[PDB]
Design a binder for this molecule. Structure first.
Ligand SMILES: *[C@@H]1O[C@H](CO)[C@@H](O)[C@H](O)[C@H]1NC(C)=O
Ligand SMILES: *[C@@H]1O[C@H](CO)[C@@H](O)[C@H](O)[C@H]1NC(C)=O
Ligand SMILES: N[C@@H](Cn1oc(=O)[nH]c1=O)C(=O)O
Ligand SMILES: N[C@@H](Cn1oc(=O)[nH]c1=O)C(=O)O
Lengths: 780, 778
């Protein structure tokens, strides 16, 4: 059958050490475990035996009690451990007070469901899953190693510290890996990370599984350099063997969780590729006295340990003819000169085994005096020993570990602990080692970043998209995970608000340089410069001087018959109208202000009114004089209107236009409004509407029609130096100009300026072609 | 400690069958169950014993080899799971084990089974999670999954349209999985589960009382209790029912466990009535009953509990045996047997059928391994149920109930339930009566036998439907169970049971709020109340105009009427007559031909019928223009002659131009106006802006002729025809102007327009034309 190591004693404590290897996938119903594991196996078994010798040899710790122990392998498998636990239970009814936990996590769960029923305590020295920390489904489980809830924090801390946010996660099958991922993935997706794709694999999978798993892990090759391997010991060995088989040459930075640890086993022989691997590991101080004891142990005196012979056969690949287990498959023989100090390595999680054994011993020590303090040993109270009373003693007991740190069990049945962020490098020529490169204690991630990455060119940040935050280029989500954001620019008026909002700045403002904020775009207008404004004001000045000259002539020459014959006051009216029309641009272009904003309307409307009204009335009177004299039969109506009625009718014809202007001014208050052709530019002009300008325009258009009709009715008339012979052309010109005005004004983009030119043309065509003629007549 | 009735044999097969009642609350750690299960334990142990002896004594099943057995009393629960595992873990011989009573009592056993490959067939477990073979590989059963039970429960609660239910349940894998399935597959369809109270089977009086008081909190709302209540839970709830003395005010509804059993209802004759109770179909086994009746305490000693079982059954004592139990005062005489008050347990045939299932699987393995030898050859020396379970996977054979046994992939024998109740046959003897049968999704109950009156139990309904015509249901914030039903808008029809939408302008929702409809418009046509006198007025105006036209054209030769003009008068006649034409053309159903005709009329009619008057007044003023001054006035020509016709035509062309312009702007078409949500009509596209322009031009052309006629007023004309034309024309203008209020002041903006046109016509005729007729009369 299967060999079982035992230690005689009144009280026997169980133990499940992964003495052999995990049974090969080929066939497990035969329960054929694989090879013998040294570090996880024989060292742990000898630790058990030797520490039990120390305990039962210690007078102060469990006096007069020889704690025997039954040691059973477990081959690190769901299968063999269950059968061994069954053999524990069948003999429970010599009794077995408690067992020392199995190696992995899933095996711990499976043994725990069995052993919680029968009040048999268990102490696991390596199981590191959250699910076992629950005290409802696994109410009766205890361990001396902190949960992985304090390890997923370590990984999130590392992956945050080095800016990575796009990584690929491989977790070994079983409860340990699945729980570890369901911790790390959630805890990083919450904080700052987005996992590429969380794979899975079996520890003992075939070479094809790794040969394809490397293909998936290189699928994201230029974006996933951080293999978040939450993996057991053998799985990382599998990926490394795959790297060697396929030829990956260090293109990865592994992150080995716990099962990798500083264990040389996983990478020995082929440690040429794991370089850069950042591997967490529980803080396990070394033990020296046991190390010397084990080193000086030889097969000749080792009989209480049954696996020692084949272990000696394995490590030194030879034969021991002095023992029945000759292992004839080997050719060479083993000599006594060989000693264990040659290439000796001590497993990482070794002090935890002794810590667990000490915890069990101290629980028994507490329970002894919890009932019969006087008696030294197993009194009548504990003859039917009850694990119920031992459970609370374990809950409350707190010894001092061999390393030194005090051990306490919380309500969850675990113990606090720290970590150690080791790392793998290349020191010598073909010589590699696990340098301590940091530490971890309740979030205080300390890492000697200087020791590794001897340059500043560290590993690629492994982010899907570079920090695309340059300038106005903004990041937007691709409709998927935030690893690969879609990065796009914003438009000229579209201002990046905080980090991604491509909002558009308001119509009045402009997004400033470097997309820092919105600035109100400076306004532009016509102050005094530019070619056309100064040209128009010079035009106005010339017209003003000419008009002043003509008015002076006709006021200092009011007696001569060449001009006194025509209505002197009507000429005075037209002169004043032309003067104000010229003056309109003198205030139309200066600067748009509240005060001038209505003077502009005053000019543009009022001026043409009397500029043409006196002309219309004069031409109507002339027509009536001539048309009535065409027949001249009687025509005995000397007065008609005549007299001074011309001045009053001009007053009233001014008054109507004044009223129209007042009505517009009241209905449309004069004030400056900001205008803009496009968003690129902003202007400022008066608030006069599309209706404001044209409100007094018809009153003058019809008046122009009336005067041109009466000029037609006169046309060629023998008068005082034939004024009408030029007034006709003047009216033709003013008609065509005022007709061409509307198309030019509407849709001009230069509405404010063309008013002055239109008024200037209307003024000059009238003045020159109806007043100037008589001026050189004054010369004669 | 626990006593075991060991039966030796060549092949010993294990099993897990309860004997006494469930463990007491304070005796859990003592590992000692309490009172005796009279109808369960002895029945099941005698069942295994008798079927085993009949199987081994029959060469047709496992020939030349005897069959042994070994069990450990479990008393239900996982409390004695310690003892069942103590027996189990023996192993390596074990070739067969049979699943214990409760599902959770067997699930961990199955988990352990999956490791070292021992077969196990259940008979009372029902949980669906056990049907999964991924993690429960070596588990089997001869009863179906609880999914069928849940489906049956949903079917029962929905057939009698119970919706708002208050659902207690038991605990373990039965209650939790059963309630998850029942809730998921019930509340989806129509069911309103109030809550799912949880309670252990052996609970105390206080917990049962508080649970009952929570259940009695919805008395007019949920009068059923959708128990997954186990037998013990029903026991306790009925204890509470009696101690409080509930009047059965809510109708119980048990589950798989509670069954027809007299086990827990007794003493409470009138209470728990109406207990619809799903029970598993199993005919009573024949050869078990007589063999059980043959058992006597002195004759049979191999069964340990059997000796004191008589003292437990009959209130007496056995002096002749060490199991005295002196607590009983009376003594047992030689006049007692098991025939009196006998009851056979319902869940009986499943045990025997499962035992036969495993025996036939073992026989199949026996033939398959070494056909040469019938018995135990060298092949069975390596005891291994791994191949045995694979052999029995496909095994099929007839069951003792006349049916067969087949193990599907899920490993449950197909079956069916019964839906049977509790009623009141006669005074002081109240008995259940099998009143239904459910089968694989095909349902059937004798709804008549249940509720053998008109009165039923109050429907498990939170609120009445209250869908009377329009009152529409709506939620409150809780689950879709209780509705504050409310009617929608009068113009809104119920889109569905909880949605409404307003009808379009065409109409309002029809009767019963079934949907929407279309109102038959309605409009103004020939007939009607008001137009009774309208075309009468129009025809009287026609009579007047025809009379005046015939008298004028018959007296046209005399220059009496030729004093001023001839063509202008004819234009007046034409205009007034066509205005009457307008008032005919209106007040009808508007169509495409009518639409533009309306515009043409109410446009050019007053236009020309007043423009001719304008020109005539112009002519008379021009005649009297020079009379006042008469200085020379040697311009008698001007235009005159026939140029008055030209001036009239050029004057009237503007109105036609504007009319055609608005005709282009507004095409002649008929639209459905909406004066009110209730009613609609049909009318042209004419608007205020459409009508005001021709009316404006006609005002422009009426003002001038008013002014010119007033300038004329009293003149020495032919009989001074101008005396009355202006006198009535002032009224003409005042009525035309004062019309705008009435037109834009009521919904009658066609009949008023017609009356306006008719009046504005008749006033011109009666003044400008009536006197001249009397003139040419004499
Ligand atoms: C990356 O992480 C390190 C850690 O301090 C630090 O440089 C910084 O916070 C992150 N960003 C860059 C650009 O380094
Ligand atoms: C609903 O319940 C009433 C109550 O008497 C019953 O008559 C009817 O058959 C049930 N089913 C339907 C579909 O109405
Ligand atoms: N990480 C594992 C333990 N463990 O896995 C290995 O591969 N070695 C080792 O110690 C767990 O805590 O479940
Ligand atoms: N009550 C259980 C079923 N059940 O009750 C028993 O007593 N045995 C049994 O299988 C349920 O509601 O599902």
């Amino acid at each position: 059958r299967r060999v079982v190591a035992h230690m005689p004693g009144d009280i026997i404590i169980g133990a499940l050490f992964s003495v052999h290897h995990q049974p090969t996938v080929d066939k497990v119903h035969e329960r054929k475990c694989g090879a013998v594991r040294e570090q996880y196996g024989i060292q742990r078994v000898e630790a058990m035996l030797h520490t039990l010798e120390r305990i039962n040899s210690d007078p102060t710790l469990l006096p007069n009690i020889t704690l025997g122990c039954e040691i059973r392998d477990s081959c690190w498998h769901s299968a063999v451990a269950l059968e061994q636990s069954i053999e524990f239970i069948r003999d429970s009814l010599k009794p077995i007070v408690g067992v020392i936990g199995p190696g992995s996590s899933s095996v711990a769960i499976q043994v725990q469901n069995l052993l919680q029923l029968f009040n048999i305590p268990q102490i696991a020295y390596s199981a590191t899953s959250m699910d076992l920390s629950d005290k409802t489904l696994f109410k009766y489980f205890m361990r001396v190693v902190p949960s992985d809830a304090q390890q997923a924090r370590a990984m999130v801390d590392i992956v945050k510290r080095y800016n990575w946010t796009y990584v690929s996660a491989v977790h070994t099958e079983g409860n340990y890996g699945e729980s570890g991922m369901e911790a790390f993935k959630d805890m990083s997706a919450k904080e700052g990370i987005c996992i590429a794709h969380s794979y899975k694999i079996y520890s003992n999978a075939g070479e094809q599984s790794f040969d394809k798993l490397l293909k998936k892990l290189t699928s994201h090759l230029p974006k996933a350099r951080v293999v978040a391997c939450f993996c057991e010991g053998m799985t990382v060995r599998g990926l490394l063997m795959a790297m060697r088989r396929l030829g990956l040459a260090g293109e990865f930075l592994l992150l080995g969780s716990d099962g990798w640890a500083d264990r040389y086993d996983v990478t020995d022989g082929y440690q040429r590729e794991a370089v850069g691997g950042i591997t967490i590991k529980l803080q396990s101080p070394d033990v020296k006295w046991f190390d010397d004891y084990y080193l000086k142990l030889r097969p000749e005196t080792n009989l209480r340990n049954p696996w020692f012979q084949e272990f000696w056969q394995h490590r030194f690949q030879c034969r021991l003819e002095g023992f029945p287990q000759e292992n004839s498959k080997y050719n060479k023989t083993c000599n006594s000169s060989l000693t264990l100090k040659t290439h000796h390595v001590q497993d990482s999680k070794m002090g935890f085994v002794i810590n667990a054994i000490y915890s069990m011993a101290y629980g028994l020590h507490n329970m002894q005096m919890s009932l019969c303090p006087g008696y030294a040993g197993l009194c009548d109270a504990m003859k039917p020993i009850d694990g119920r009373k031992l459970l609370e003693s374990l809950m409350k007991t707190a010894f001092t570990g061999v390393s030194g740190d005090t051990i306490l069990f919380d309500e969850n049945g675990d113990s606090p602990g720290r970590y150690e962020i080791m790392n793998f490098k290349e020191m010598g020529k073909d010589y590699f080692d696990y340098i301590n490169v940091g530490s971890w204690d309740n979030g205080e991630l300390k890492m000697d970043d200087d020791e590794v990455w001897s340059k500043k060119s560290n590993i690629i940040r492994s982010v899907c998209s570079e920090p695309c935050e340059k300038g106005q280029i903004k990041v937007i989500r691709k409709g998927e995970v935030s690893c690969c954001w879609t990065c796009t620019p914003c438009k000229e008026n579209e201002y990046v608000f905080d980090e991604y909002t491509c909002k558009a700045c308001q119509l009045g403002s402009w997004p400033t340089d470097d997309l820092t904020g919105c600035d109100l775009i400076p306004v532009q207008y016509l102050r005094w410069g530019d070619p056309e404004p100064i040209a128009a004001v010079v035009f106005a000045c010339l017209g003003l001087l000419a008009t002043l000259f003509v008015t002076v002539v006709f006021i200092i020459y009011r007696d001569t018959p060449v001009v006194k014959s025509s209505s002197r006051e009507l000429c005075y009216i037209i002169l004043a109208g032309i003067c104000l029309g010229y003056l309109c641009t003198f205030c139309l272009i200066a600067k748009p202000k509240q005060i001038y904003c209505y003077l502009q309307r005053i000019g543009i409307g009022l001026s043409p009114a009397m500029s043409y009204s006196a002309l219309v009335t004069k031409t109507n009177r002339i027509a009536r004089i001539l048309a009535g004299s065409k027949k001249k039969i009687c025509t005995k109506k000397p007065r008609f209107m005549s007299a001074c009625a011309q001045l009053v009718i001009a007053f009233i014809l001014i008054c109507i236009q004044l009223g129209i202007i007042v009505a517009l001014f009241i209905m449309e208050p004069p004030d400056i409004m900001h205008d803009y052709p496009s968003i690129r530019e902003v202007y400022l002009i008066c608030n006069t509407t599309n209706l404001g300008v044209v409100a007094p325009l018809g009153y003058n258009g019809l008046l122009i029609l009336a005067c041109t009709f009466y000029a037609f009715k006169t046309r060629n008339v023998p008068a005082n130096f034939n004024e009408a012979k030029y007034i006709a052309f003047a009216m033709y010109t003013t008609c065509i100009i005022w007709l061409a005005f509307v198309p030019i004004y509407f849709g001009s983009n230069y509405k404010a300026i063309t008013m002055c030119f239109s008024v200037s043309l209307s003024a000059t065509v009238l003045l020159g072609c109806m007043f100037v003629p008589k001026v050189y007549i004054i010369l004669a």
